[PDB]
Design an enzyme around this catalytic site. Structure first.
Site, PDB file in Angstrom:
ATOM      1  N   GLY A 239      37.876  42.843  37.423  1.00 43.85           N
ATOM      2  CA  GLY A 239      36.814  42.882  36.446  1.00 43.85           C
ATOM      3  C   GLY A 239      37.271  42.394  35.096  1.00 43.85           C
ATOM      4  O   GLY A 239      38.463  42.440  34.771  1.00 43.85           O
TER       5      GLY A 239
ATOM      6  N   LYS B   4      43.428  49.005  32.963  1.00 43.45           N
ATOM      7  CA  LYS B   4      42.776  48.224  31.924  1.00 43.45           C
ATOM      8  C   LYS B   4      43.817  47.728  30.929  1.00 43.45           C
ATOM      9  O   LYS B   4      44.623  48.513  30.407  1.00 43.45           O
ATOM     10  CB  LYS B   4      41.711  49.062  31.216  1.00 43.45           C
ATOM     11  CG  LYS B   4      40.751  48.263  30.361  1.00 43.45           C
ATOM     12  CD  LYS B   4      39.490  49.120  30.097  1.00 43.45           C
ATOM     13  CE  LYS B   4      38.411  48.375  29.342  1.00 43.45           C
ATOM     14  NZ  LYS B   4      37.258  49.311  29.050  1.00 43.45           N
TER      15      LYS B   4
ATOM     16  N   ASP C 165      26.358  51.484  25.782  1.00 41.75           N
ATOM     17  CA  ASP C 165      26.418  50.357  26.713  1.00 41.75           C
ATOM     18  C   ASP C 165      25.999  50.803  28.102  1.00 41.75           C
ATOM     19  O   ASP C 165      26.664  50.524  29.104  1.00 41.75           O
ATOM     20  CB  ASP C 165      27.818  49.750  26.736  1.00 41.75           C
ATOM     21  CG  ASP C 165      27.849  48.347  27.315  1.00 41.75           C
ATOM     22  OD1 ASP C 165      26.790  47.707  27.474  1.00 41.75           O
ATOM     23  OD2 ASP C 165      28.975  47.900  27.620  1.00 41.75           O
TER      24      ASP C 165
END
Lengths: 7, 289
Positions: free
Chosen positions: B15, B37, B127
């Site tokens: 991603g 991440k 978000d």
């Protein structure tokens, strides 16, 4: 249209 | 071998986003798969470490991923997370971009609760979108998790609960497709906006697409104006045509909240629960997939 945007 | 934290083997990139890339990882200690991440240290926007602090503040909440390690290594800030299952966008695509009403309502009840929990911890998410809700793994495969706190922020003081101040003239934060109308109008985000975005997510699941999705433009300046112009010009009653009135009632309620109002989360859950019962559904965790 789906990109995370920052202020 | 290449390992972040001396401990997590780096795997394929799974991603990408504005605030870093996400990779598969493997905890060599346990063989547990993780999500890693990475944010470049030379970034305009030191954010990942702030996101990691928010995750730590939320730990233990239902449907909040566990953070396993954060640190600086090489050219990257690193945040290692528990690996969750597919996102709701993934599952929507898997189901050929059709969800039954039952699945939409099962998801709505949990998603309202996840947002409420974040607000209870003094943050707004900013978000809300299908990519940012993931199903748990294996045993927790019936549980909806919320991810991506890179745009999250405090909306009230933790001690006094003084709400942050109102302002206008703001540039858009979040994603154009799911942003609230007030966000398009440049208004400071608050609790109501997370819930309005969820309302668009639910109608997206019902429709397969939103009416302001896939508009022709050229500049990104003009594209977001196209979206903001369509979203405002589409009445809620037109958006929700062909679907139960609860979806319009939900959206109108969110649009009617004032900037610093506390949402009635229980009212919003009960709108959909009542519909769920009227439909004769049972809360048996049989999703479409």
């Amino acid at each position: 249209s789906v990109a995370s945007l920052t202020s | 071998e290449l390992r972040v934290g001396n401990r997590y083997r780096l795997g394929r990139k799974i991603g990408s986003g504005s605030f870093g890339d996400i990779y598969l990882g493997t905890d060599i200690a346990a063989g547990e798969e993780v999500a890693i991440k990475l944010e470049c240290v030379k970034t305009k926007h030191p954010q990942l470490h702030i996101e990691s602090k928010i995750y730590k503040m939320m730990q233990g909440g239902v449907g909040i991923p566990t953070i396993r390690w954060c640190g600086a290594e090489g050219d990257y800030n690193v945040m290692v997370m528990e690996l969750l299952g597919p996102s709701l966008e993934d599952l929507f695509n898997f189901c050929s971009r059709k969800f039954s009403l039952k699945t939409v309502l099962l998801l709505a009840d949990q998603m309202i609760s996840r947002i409420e929990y974040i607000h209870s911890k003094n943050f707004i998410h900013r978000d809300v979108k299908p990519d940012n809700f993931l199903m748990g793994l294996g045993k927790k495969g019936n549980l909806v998790y919320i991810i991506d706190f890179g745009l999250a922020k405090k909306y009230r003081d933790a001690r006094t609960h003084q709400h942050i101040p109102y302002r206008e003239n703001k540039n858009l934060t979040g994603t154009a497709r799911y942003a609230s109308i007030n966000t398009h109008l440049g208004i400071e985000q608050s609790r109501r906006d997370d819930l309005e975005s969820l309302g668009y997510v639910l109608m997206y699941f019902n429709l397969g697409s939103l009416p302001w999705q896939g508009l022709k433009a050229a500049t990104k300046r003009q594209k977001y104006e196209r979206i903001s112009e369509k979203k405002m010009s589409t009445p809620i009653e037109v958006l929700c045509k062909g679907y139960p009135s609860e979806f319009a009632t939900y959206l109108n309620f969110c649009r009617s909240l004032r900037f610093d109002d506390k949402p009635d989360y229980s009212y919003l859950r009960q709108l959909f629960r009542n519909l769920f019962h009227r439909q004769g559904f049972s809360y048996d965790y049989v999703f479409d997939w």
